[PDB]
Each structure stands twice: as structure tokens, then as C-alpha cells.
Coordinates of C-alpha atoms in Angstrom, one line a residue:
Chain A
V339 CA 10.7 41.5 -17.9
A340 CA 8.0 41.3 -15.3
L341 CA 6.5 38.6 -17.5
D342 CA 8.3 35.4 -18.4
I343 CA 11.0 36.9 -21.2
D344 CA 14.2 36.0 -21.3
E345 CA 16.5 38.8 -21.1
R346 CA 19.0 37.5 -23.7
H347 CA 16.4 37.0 -26.2
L348 CA 15.4 40.4 -25.6
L349 CA 17.0 43.3 -27.8
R350 CA 16.1 47.3 -28.6
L351 CA 17.4 48.6 -31.6
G352 CA 17.8 52.8 -31.9
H353 CA 20.7 55.1 -31.0
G354 CA 23.0 54.7 -28.4
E355 CA 22.7 58.1 -26.8
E356 CA 19.2 57.7 -25.9
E357 CA 18.9 57.0 -22.0
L358 CA 17.6 53.6 -21.0
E359 CA 14.8 54.3 -18.7
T360 CA 14.8 50.3 -17.8
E361 CA 16.9 48.6 -15.3
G362 CA 18.7 46.5 -17.6
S363 CA 20.2 48.4 -20.5
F364 CA 18.6 46.7 -23.8
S365 CA 21.0 48.4 -26.1
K366 CA 23.7 46.3 -27.9
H367 CA 26.6 47.2 -25.7
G368 CA 24.1 46.5 -22.9
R369 CA 23.4 43.4 -24.1
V370 CA 26.9 42.5 -24.6
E371 CA 27.7 43.4 -20.9
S372 CA 24.8 41.4 -19.8
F373 CA 26.2 38.2 -21.9
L374 CA 29.5 38.3 -20.5
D375 CA 28.3 38.9 -16.9
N376 CA 25.7 35.7 -17.3
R377 CA 28.6 33.8 -19.2
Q378 CA 31.0 34.7 -16.1
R379 CA 28.4 33.6 -14.0
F380 CA 28.0 30.3 -15.5
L381 CA 31.7 29.7 -15.8
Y382 CA 31.5 30.2 -11.5
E383 CA 28.7 27.9 -11.3
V384 CA 30.3 25.3 -13.5
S385 CA 33.5 25.3 -11.9
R386 CA 31.8 25.2 -8.6
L387 CA 29.8 22.2 -10.3
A388 CA 33.2 20.3 -11.3
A389 CA 34.6 20.7 -7.7
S390 CA 31.5 19.4 -6.3
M391 CA 31.6 16.3 -8.6
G392 CA 35.2 16.0 -8.6
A393 CA 35.9 16.8 -11.8
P394 CA 39.8 17.3 -12.6
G395 CA 40.9 20.3 -14.5
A396 CA 39.5 23.8 -14.5
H397 CA 36.2 23.7 -16.6
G398 CA 35.1 27.1 -15.7
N399 CA 38.0 28.6 -18.2
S400 CA 36.1 29.3 -21.2
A401 CA 32.1 28.6 -22.4
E402 CA 33.1 25.8 -24.8
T403 CA 35.1 24.0 -22.4
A404 CA 32.5 24.4 -20.0
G405 CA 30.2 23.0 -22.3
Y406 CA 32.5 20.2 -23.1
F407 CA 33.0 19.4 -19.8
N408 CA 29.4 19.5 -18.7
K409 CA 28.2 17.0 -21.6
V410 CA 31.1 14.6 -20.8
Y411 CA 30.3 15.0 -17.2
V412 CA 26.8 15.0 -16.9
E413 CA 25.5 13.2 -20.3
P414 CA 26.8 9.9 -18.6
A415 CA 25.8 10.7 -15.3
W416 CA 22.1 11.6 -16.5
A417 CA 21.9 8.7 -18.7
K418 CA 22.7 6.4 -15.6
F419 CA 20.3 8.5 -13.4
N420 CA 17.6 7.7 -15.7
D421 CA 18.5 4.1 -16.3
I422 CA 18.5 3.4 -12.2
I423 CA 15.1 5.4 -12.4
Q424 CA 13.7 3.5 -15.2
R425 CA 13.7 0.2 -13.0
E426 CA 10.5 -0.6 -11.6
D427 CA 12.3 -1.9 -8.0
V428 CA 13.7 1.6 -7.7
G429 CA 11.8 3.3 -5.3
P430 CA 11.7 7.2 -4.4
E431 CA 14.7 6.5 -1.5
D432 CA 16.8 4.9 -4.1
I433 CA 16.0 7.8 -6.6
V434 CA 17.1 10.1 -4.4
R435 CA 20.3 8.3 -3.3
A436 CA 21.3 8.0 -6.9
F437 CA 21.2 11.8 -7.8
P438 CA 24.5 13.1 -8.5
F439 CA 23.5 16.6 -8.3
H440 CA 23.0 16.6 -4.5
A441 CA 26.2 18.6 -3.5
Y442 CA 25.9 21.2 -6.3
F443 CA 22.2 21.4 -4.9
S444 CA 23.3 22.0 -0.9
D445 CA 23.2 25.4 -1.5
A446 CA 19.8 25.4 -2.1
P447 CA 17.2 25.7 0.8
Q448 CA 17.0 22.1 2.4
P449 CA 15.3 19.3 1.8
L450 CA 15.8 19.0 -1.9
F451 CA 13.7 16.3 -1.8
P452 CA 11.0 16.1 1.2
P453 CA 10.9 12.9 3.2
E454 CA 7.2 12.6 2.8
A455 CA 7.6 13.0 -1.0
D456 CA 7.0 10.4 -3.1
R457 CA 8.5 8.8 -6.2
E458 CA 6.9 11.2 -8.5
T459 CA 8.0 14.5 -6.4
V460 CA 11.4 13.0 -6.2
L461 CA 11.5 12.3 -10.1
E462 CA 10.1 16.0 -10.5
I463 CA 13.0 17.9 -8.3
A464 CA 15.8 15.6 -10.0
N465 CA 14.2 16.8 -13.6
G466 CA 14.2 20.3 -11.9
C467 CA 17.7 20.4 -11.0
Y468 CA 18.9 18.6 -14.3
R469 CA 17.0 21.2 -16.1
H470 CA 18.6 24.2 -14.2
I471 CA 21.9 22.4 -14.9
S472 CA 21.2 22.2 -18.9
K473 CA 19.7 26.1 -18.4
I474 CA 23.2 26.9 -17.2
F475 CA 24.8 24.9 -19.8
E476 CA 22.5 26.3 -22.7
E477 CA 23.5 30.0 -21.5
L478 CA 27.2 29.1 -21.7
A479 CA 26.7 27.9 -25.2
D480 CA 24.6 30.9 -26.2
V481 CA 27.4 33.3 -24.5
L482 CA 29.9 31.2 -26.4
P483 CA 29.1 32.8 -29.7
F484 CA 29.2 36.3 -28.7
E485 CA 32.7 35.3 -27.0
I486 CA 33.8 33.4 -30.8
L487 CA 33.2 36.6 -32.4
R488 CA 35.9 39.5 -31.8
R489 CA 34.2 42.7 -33.2
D490 CA 31.2 44.1 -31.3
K491 CA 29.7 44.8 -34.8
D492 CA 30.1 41.3 -35.7
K493 CA 28.9 40.2 -32.7
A494 CA 25.8 42.2 -32.3
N495 CA 24.9 41.4 -36.1
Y496 CA 25.0 37.7 -35.1
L497 CA 23.1 38.3 -32.0
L498 CA 20.3 40.4 -33.6
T499 CA 20.0 37.8 -36.6
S500 CA 19.9 34.4 -34.6
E501 CA 20.2 34.7 -30.6
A502 CA 17.6 37.4 -30.7
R503 CA 14.4 36.1 -30.5
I504 CA 12.1 39.2 -29.4
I505 CA 13.6 42.8 -31.2
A506 CA 12.1 45.8 -30.3
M507 CA 12.5 49.3 -32.1
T508 CA 11.3 52.2 -33.4
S509 CA 9.7 53.4 -37.0
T510 CA 12.1 55.9 -37.3
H511 CA 14.9 53.5 -36.7
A512 CA 13.3 50.9 -38.6
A513 CA 12.9 52.7 -41.3
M514 CA 16.4 54.2 -41.4
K515 CA 17.9 50.9 -41.1
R516 CA 15.6 48.9 -43.5
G517 CA 18.2 48.2 -45.9
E518 CA 20.5 47.3 -43.1
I519 CA 17.8 44.8 -41.9
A520 CA 17.3 43.3 -45.1
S521 CA 20.8 42.9 -46.1
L522 CA 21.6 41.2 -42.7
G523 CA 19.7 38.5 -43.2
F524 CA 17.2 38.9 -40.3
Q525 CA 14.0 37.1 -40.1
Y526 CA 11.0 37.8 -38.4
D527 CA 7.6 35.5 -38.2
Chain B
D641 CA 44.6 -2.3 -18.1
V642 CA 46.1 -4.2 -15.0
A643 CA 47.9 -6.7 -16.8
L644 CA 49.7 -3.7 -18.9
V645 CA 51.7 -2.4 -16.0
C646 CA 54.5 -4.7 -15.2
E647 CA 57.3 -4.9 -12.3
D648 CA 59.5 -2.3 -14.2
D649 CA 56.9 0.4 -14.3
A650 CA 56.1 -0.3 -10.4
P651 CA 58.8 2.4 -9.5
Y652 CA 57.4 4.7 -12.1
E653 CA 53.6 3.9 -10.6
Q654 CA 55.1 4.7 -7.0
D655 CA 56.6 7.9 -8.2
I656 CA 53.3 8.8 -9.9
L657 CA 51.4 8.0 -6.6
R658 CA 53.9 10.1 -4.9
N659 CA 53.5 13.2 -7.1
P660 CA 50.2 13.3 -8.8
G661 CA 51.0 16.7 -10.4
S662 CA 54.4 16.2 -11.7
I663 CA 54.9 16.9 -15.7
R664 CA 58.9 15.5 -15.1
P665 CA 58.0 12.1 -13.4
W666 CA 55.4 11.9 -16.2
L667 CA 57.1 12.7 -18.9
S668 CA 59.9 10.3 -17.4
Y669 CA 57.4 7.3 -17.4
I670 CA 56.2 8.5 -20.9
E671 CA 59.8 7.8 -22.4
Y672 CA 60.2 4.9 -20.3
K673 CA 56.9 3.2 -21.5
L674 CA 58.2 4.3 -25.1
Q675 CA 61.8 3.3 -25.3
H676 CA 61.2 -0.3 -23.7
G677 CA 57.5 -1.0 -23.2
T678 CA 55.1 -2.3 -25.9
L679 CA 52.9 0.0 -28.2
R680 CA 49.8 -1.3 -26.0
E681 CA 51.7 -0.4 -22.8
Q682 CA 52.8 3.3 -24.2
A683 CA 49.4 4.2 -25.7
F684 CA 47.7 3.1 -22.1
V685 CA 50.2 5.1 -20.2
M686 CA 49.7 8.3 -22.7
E687 CA 46.2 7.7 -22.3
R688 CA 46.2 7.8 -18.1
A689 CA 48.8 10.4 -18.7
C690 CA 46.5 12.5 -20.6
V691 CA 43.3 11.7 -18.4
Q692 CA 45.5 12.5 -15.3
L693 CA 47.1 15.6 -16.8
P694 CA 45.0 17.2 -19.4
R695 CA 47.0 20.7 -18.8
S696 CA 50.2 19.7 -19.7
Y697 CA 51.1 21.3 -23.4
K698 CA 53.9 18.7 -23.7
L699 CA 51.8 15.8 -22.8
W700 CA 49.6 16.7 -25.5
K701 CA 51.9 17.6 -28.5
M702 CA 53.6 14.1 -27.5
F703 CA 50.6 12.2 -28.0
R704 CA 50.2 9.7 -30.6
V705 CA 47.2 7.6 -32.2
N706 CA 49.6 5.4 -34.5
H707 CA 48.2 2.6 -32.6
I708 CA 44.9 2.8 -34.1
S709 CA 45.8 4.6 -37.3
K710 CA 46.6 0.9 -38.9
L711 CA 43.4 -0.3 -38.4
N712 CA 39.8 0.3 -40.5
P713 CA 37.8 3.0 -38.7
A714 CA 34.8 0.7 -39.6
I715 CA 35.7 -2.4 -37.4
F716 CA 37.8 -0.3 -35.0
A717 CA 35.4 2.3 -34.2
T718 CA 35.5 2.2 -30.5
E719 CA 38.9 3.0 -30.4
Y720 CA 38.0 6.0 -32.9
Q721 CA 35.3 6.8 -30.1
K722 CA 37.8 6.7 -27.3
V723 CA 40.4 8.9 -29.3
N724 CA 37.4 11.5 -30.1
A725 CA 36.6 11.7 -26.3
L726 CA 40.6 11.9 -25.3
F727 CA 40.7 14.7 -27.9
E728 CA 37.2 16.4 -26.4
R729 CA 39.2 16.3 -22.9
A730 CA 42.1 18.0 -24.6
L731 CA 40.5 20.4 -26.2
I732 CA 38.2 21.3 -22.8
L733 CA 41.7 21.4 -21.4
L734 CA 43.7 23.1 -24.2
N735 CA 41.0 25.1 -26.5
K736 CA 44.1 27.4 -27.1
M737 CA 46.4 24.9 -28.2
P738 CA 46.8 25.0 -32.2
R739 CA 48.9 21.9 -32.8
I740 CA 46.2 20.1 -30.6
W741 CA 43.5 21.5 -32.9
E742 CA 45.2 20.6 -35.8
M743 CA 46.0 16.8 -34.7
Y744 CA 42.2 16.8 -34.3
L745 CA 41.5 17.6 -37.4
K746 CA 43.8 15.2 -39.3
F747 CA 42.2 12.4 -37.1
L748 CA 39.0 13.7 -38.3
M749 CA 40.1 13.8 -41.9
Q750 CA 41.0 10.6 -41.2
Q751 CA 38.0 9.4 -40.3
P752 CA 35.0 9.2 -43.1
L753 CA 32.4 11.3 -41.0
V754 CA 32.2 14.4 -43.6
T755 CA 29.8 16.2 -40.9
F756 CA 31.4 15.5 -38.1
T757 CA 34.7 16.5 -39.6
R758 CA 32.7 20.0 -40.9
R759 CA 31.4 20.8 -37.4
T760 CA 35.0 19.9 -36.0
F761 CA 36.4 22.6 -38.2
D762 CA 33.9 24.8 -37.9
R763 CA 34.6 25.0 -34.2
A764 CA 38.2 25.2 -34.9
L765 CA 37.6 28.6 -36.9
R766 CA 35.4 29.9 -34.5
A767 CA 37.7 29.3 -31.5
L768 CA 41.0 30.1 -32.8
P769 CA 42.6 33.0 -33.9

């Protein structure tokens, strides 16, 4: 957690009665609760971005709906921004003025684009904003598979098999659940 | 699309401008376009109603793609892409609707894209009850 490791890809295997000394619950129920909280935060952020961009409808109602609306809105907008920045006659001021996420980034510490910043720095800032939007969309899409499954055990199995990239377990827990791990189709490198 | 609206639909346009979120005026305009207007004008009015009011279940259930089903999808792929975008917007607004999902599945089965139809069927199975 102190290093650059995502909490969504981090999971812990063991008994549910053990006390978690970490600040965040790394168990299956704790990971599900953290994913639900991240999904709610991403839905609120997507609703705020849709209100700033003037997108009609409730885009923060569901994670799949948020992903579809985010694609159908941002992808033409990001393509238009990239086409405008691809022109050789477009300067840093034109690139800053053509950014469509200025209202969404208004909550950030002003200025988003410095006046002394060159075209490269403005392009880097726009790419950082687009990467933040894409990371929010990816978090919503990752939390969508948990919301699609209804059973908690099925959601935990789907998270451990595919969604989890780092899984920490004890030797006794690995030995007791070796057959379950083999039957679940979980693969490690 | 400007020529698709005539003087008869001018009162309907004024009523839509006065009340942009009225389900009854939109339904009345759709019924007037279906009863008197041409197929292209009715399709344009239905597309405008779906774009303006995508959360209306009655508008989504009464949506028809019969104006593009009679054409070859290999030559009329632009109309198929527009219908796919409209269905994506409807699924963004009405993801819990089973009738809209069935209509989208039928439209995908009409098209020859096997992988896209399989992905749509998987998404419908994962997203519905």
C-alpha cells in the first residue's frame, strides 16, 4: 500500500475471523466493499462530468451505463481534441482552448495549464486529464463485473480468477485450498 | 433533416420547445408523424424523441427500425451504425429494460457480425436477470 500497488488488484486469502492489521480490509468481503465504494465514487464523478459536459440523462446510474456514456461522449471528443492537436498550426493556447474537460478539471488546483507552459506541457496536462478520465472509466468497468454477479462467492471467485493480480496467502491456507485453487482455474506467473 | 419538418409539424415543434420533457407531447408528435407523415420523417421524429428523451420506456418500446431492415446491411452499414448508436444510448438509459435488450439482440441477429452479436448476447446475459 505504501508502494505503487493498486488496492483493487491486491487480495488476501485466509480465514474471515482473523483481524486485519492493515488500514484497508484485504479480505474478499473487504475487497467487495472497497470495490462498491469505488464504484459509487466513480459513478458520482461520471455524473459530475456529464453535468459539466451537458450530457442528458443519468449517466451515473450504472457502471455499464457509465462506461457506455463515457465512451459515446469522450471518444468523439478525445478524437476531435487529438485531431486539433495534430495540426501543425495549433499552438499551446489553441490546444488549451480546445480541451473539453476544463469544467471537469475546474475543481483541481488552478491553473490547469500554466501561461508560461509550452505546447508540450499543455499536451502533457491534457493527456494527464484524459488518463484520469480513462482510469475512472476503467475502475467503473472493473467494478461492473462485481455488480454483474449476484452471489458473493461467485463474485469473489471471478475477482480472484481474473481481476486479482496480486494475491497474498499463508502456507496453511494454500495447502488447505490447493484443490479449490486448481479447480477454480486461477493462474499465476 | 431540416426539410423533414413541415408546416403541419410546426405546432408540434412549438409544443416540444415549450415542454422539452413532456412524454405526452412527444407521444402525440410521434402518433401524428406515424399517421400522416412519411416513413423517413417518422423515423427522424422517433430518433429525435429517443435522443431527447431516452429514459421514456414507451418511446423505447415503440421504436422501430423497419426503415433500415429492408436494405442490405453491406451497403447500408451507416444506417446500421446509427441504429447501433441509438441502441447503445437506449441501453445507457434503459439497461434494465428486457424488451429493448430483445430488440437489440434481434437487430444484431439481423446483422452478419457474429463476434459483435456474441459480445452483445454476453453483455445482455451478464446485465439482466
